[PDB]
């Protein structure tokens, strides 16, 4: 808001946004998030219904992981 006002001051509504965006320094997305994101494997029950092969919910030993 500050820089939009100051840019309107000298009088050098779309390109104004692209000017302000580049002219200013802001906090990036990461330092304003507060949530975490995880993935839940593909269930075998669901993969056997729509006819798909679930590589994810298949368990594995420690030797088999190459």
């Amino acid at each position: 808001s500050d820089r939009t006002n100051e840019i309107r001051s000298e009088n050098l509504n779309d390109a104004l946004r692209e000017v302000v965006e580049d002219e200013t320094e802001l906090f990036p997305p990461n330092l304003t998030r507060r949530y975490f994101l995880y993935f839940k494997p593909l269930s075998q029950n669901c993969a056997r219904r729509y006819r798909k092969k679930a590589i994810s919910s298949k368990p594995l030993s420690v030797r088999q992981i190459k």
Binding site: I7, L12, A15, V19
Partner: peptide, 25 residues
């Protein structure tokens, strides 16, 4: 000039050329 181009629509450093009318050694 950066603002002027963006609002009036790869810019190198601009050259300053000085012209004067004063004492001459």
């Amino acid at each position: 000039a950066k603002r002027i181009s963006i609002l009036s629509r790869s810019l190198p450093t601009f050259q300053l050329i000085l012209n004067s009318n004063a004492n001459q050694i």
